[PDB]
Assembly symmetry: C5
Homo-oligomer: 257 residues x 5
């Protein structure tokens, strides 16, 4: 799946690519599970090699945040929920070269879907590939913060269910939900931590136009402010787990009596 | 619910609003669950847009501590107990513009109720919107410190139930109380942490008249001194949980024998 | 209960107060659960308002470490054991004004009893209210260190018990007693640490007093880790015990 | 087992040692469980004392990262899996002296096996003992990162077994404990390489090309350690949830 | 028990003290559970008061690391195993005055036993009391590191026993061994931490001849490198404890069925 976008008055407008062959006019090329026809098309029409599937698995800093003849590379976890509502992180390879942004990804993602919807009726400021990359990160953080907000409200309700060792079988259900909330929070943290590394790298490495530099710092500031929330949820979750076992053992005693 | 206050010899005096239409004379407008008639009234009589309900859910720094054409915005958790005696945090949007303070909130709050009572017979120092905002934070901290104090004394009594009782009935009750104290402390910490960010932002961002600056630092100093107490309670609570499970298992053994 | 002390060759000597009315000669006024007659006596004979009972409950820095028209105020937890041998902290309001120290407290305390015993037959150095306040803190830390030392030796014996029966109920109970002592010792230390940090930045402290304060801060820094180390051991012991209890449960069911 | 390597256009080429006696031409001598005949051969043909077996057990900084008349010494944990698929760390003594690298080890290791494969058809940059040492550390980190990646995917599958019987649960706890252990041993390996590289940066004149290489490895380690810590949280939480399910099950049974 | 040592070509040589009365020639006096005859002998022949038994119990910095008319005092935990193979720490009072070292101890200790054995055929460098004190600390650290090394190998074997979660007999034994390894590690950490304070004090306080200063820093560096190992063992130990309880509960279920 190949989509391309060009700029018109600092407004991202969707290029037709099946028909309007010239890719050279695009500021952003976005690939989702691209076949070899699409890869080769980018290779020949632009200068651009793209990362292979196993290179997106690499978690080492030097494999994710690096500069080379193919441009500036940032690989970053993006958060998603699979078909059975199980949280996950999907690595996206960002590449910036000659003022063009390339995003290579394994699947559809809610941040991208959201940014694209907004980009349809919303002006960029400086109108460049670095701004675009950060806009996508802004969007990511916005969603991560929404995830955390919902862990709180779900955990609040679940908390009240757990305050009785009244078991059968709203308690099997409670432990399961706890474990689902732990896992979401855990994966949100990985996503935040990784974006944090990515942005710290960017700040030291890319000439970032100054409007872009402040934007990046703003996102870093948001991340610094979300991480503690994440850590706070783990305490609560772990305590709730402990209390539940207490109630289960109290119940066991009742039963044996 | 719209209340408005004006200043008379550095004394907040309650300006009648059903009758005395001119809002322009107020230093402080306080909204509680305001209907669209009240919102629009503030919009037209002053310049003032107010934050929407879902914008108060946002926990990201950049959504809580920011400056824009509508003025200086500080969103801050305030602590309360709901109708069924469950602790909670309620976000209050503070907005300062052209020397006037706007507080927008979802519900009655004990800090506000308390500050208003006092403000009926008590002089402000410099008599301005920044002082007023900090006075409300001072009051918040005063109450948070009282909460912590009471967690201590409650935990002290509960501690003795957990060493001296072995009935199954007074022990369900004990675990429940433990969990109620854990939750209060947890929510107090969130409240403190958030006020801390808010005040750090204020110190760097607002021209704060120097009398206000020292006031803010005093509040910051109080917070630095309350956070460790919070953390100390969690250790005790967790240890008590562990001891209880030990006693429950010792009891189980007695029963089976 | 009102006691007063005056200085004689840098030696604290106990003033008779039922009889020798002039309080003005005292360097140190010590109140224990004082009635309104004693409070008013301090109010009129010296300039001195004293903190009220509910103000000693306040834990907020700004309510404990502050300066005002009534002088320099330091509120600080002191460690004690109640009638049933249960550990506790009692807040003591220290107030320094015009070279005189005021201590207001809710109860008798071992640090004070100990300092008073010694102060009979022991010379102060610079002989002033700031030294006196720090001398009381020195004594407090001395006793806190003793408490920790004993948690160690008690925990050592208890450790061996934990490696069917009636002696295990007893073990868990003792563990929980030792946890609580250590916990309350830490609160006491942490609070004295804030108090001394405040003092260092705030009071003109005569230089002899400044080094004294730093010495106490250094002691606290060296005791806090011990406290934390005990919690690890205590928590681990608790865990092992539950393991043994479950192993026992399995033996029984078989 | 004695292997020796010399340089030819910045390409490590394997010296024949059974036959081509002169060791003096080697840039890298690599010893695996060397007998006293091999040790003595290094002692006499080069100046080189080698660390004894019990000196590789020593974990103290001053026993692992030090300089003396015998040269520059770096002892470092390398990660491996034994015959029964159990994770382990094996200390390797690196020694650099008069532009020559000596590696002394107790066993075959996957990092070395991998670096040697690659070195057969791959050019070094500056072509020296310090680069060589760092190349081996680079390779080590590459493999540690792969381990962590696999702990994640295994833990993901195991997570679902624990949410979704008595038989498949013994097995689950055992797997959990295998993953904890791997992560634990990876951390020890990372931490130790980190000390080693910090020491190197302050101590050896490191040619500037080497210096950046070392910092790159340090940067990778900084980025892998948090992953390690993150796994321990998940593992510990999974352990707790399992006990919860086991106790719920116990209650069902007793009823 | 009084032993005394003098220097001969930077070689500690054991003075005969029953017979060769002059103690003034010694660089090192070493007391083990000394009676009042030996204490008084040191008091009169040298200037030297020695710390009393209850003064070695004091753990407060100011009671362990201090200077006074009696010289330079360093009290330090040394590690040992008692008659019933239980790990322990024994405080040793080091005192340096007029170029002479005094060590006062409650019992035989493996570091001292080891240093003395080596000192019989090994030259000191600068040949002074400060070097001697540090040599003893070097030896201590050497042994602590050996302890940690052995905790690792014992914990490795024990780890494999605990994955066979089956028999009731080899499991009592396993928990016991775990608890014995936890305790050793715990006491090793106390020993390390205390030596660390002692050496930090020494570095700021004693004129330390420069050869001695580097020696001290080397020991500090070793300690900094051993502490993390200690902390790592606690995580493993705690995790193993948890897994064991899991296997015990699985077994309990099997039994009840
Ligand atoms: Mg949101
Ligand atoms: Mg636990
Ligand atoms: Mg059970
Ligand atoms: Mg209060
Ligand atoms: Mg003492
Ligand atoms: Mg050794
Ligand atoms: Mg790889």
């Amino acid at each position: 799946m190949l989509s391309a976008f060009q700029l018109e008055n600092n407004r991202l407008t969707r290029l037709e690519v099946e028909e309007s062959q010239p890719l050279v006019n695009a500021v952003w090329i976005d690939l989702v599970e691209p076949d070899d026809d699409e890869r080769l098309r980018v290779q020949s029409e632009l200068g651009q090699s793209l990362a292979t599937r196993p290179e997106l698995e690499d978690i080492e800093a030097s494999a994710r945040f690096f500069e080379d003849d193919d441009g500036l590379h940032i690989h970053s976890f993006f958060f998603f929920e699979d078909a059975e509502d199980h949280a996950g992180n999907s690595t996206v390879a960002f590449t910036i070269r000659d003022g063009r942004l390339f995003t290579l990804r394994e699947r559809e993602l809610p941040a991208f879907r959201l940014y694209r919807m907004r980009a349809r009726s919303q002006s960029m400021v400086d109108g460049n590939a670095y701004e675009l990359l950060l806009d996508l990160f802004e969007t990511k953080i916005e969603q991560l913060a929404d995830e955390i907000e919902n862990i709180y409200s779900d955990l609040e309700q679940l908390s009240r269910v757990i305050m009785e060792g009244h078991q059968g079988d709203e308690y099997d259900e409670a432990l399961s939900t706890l474990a689902e909330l732990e896992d979401i929070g855990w994966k949100v943290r990985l996503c935040l931590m990784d974006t944090q590394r990515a942005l710290n790298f960017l700040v030291r490495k890319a000439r970032l136009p100054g409007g872009q530099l402040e934007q990046a710092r703003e996102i870093l500031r948001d991340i610094e402010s979300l991480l503690p929330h994440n850590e706070s949820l783990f305490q609560k979750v772990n305590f709730l787990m402990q209390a539940a076992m207490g109630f289960i053992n109290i119940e066991q005693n009742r039963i044996i009596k």
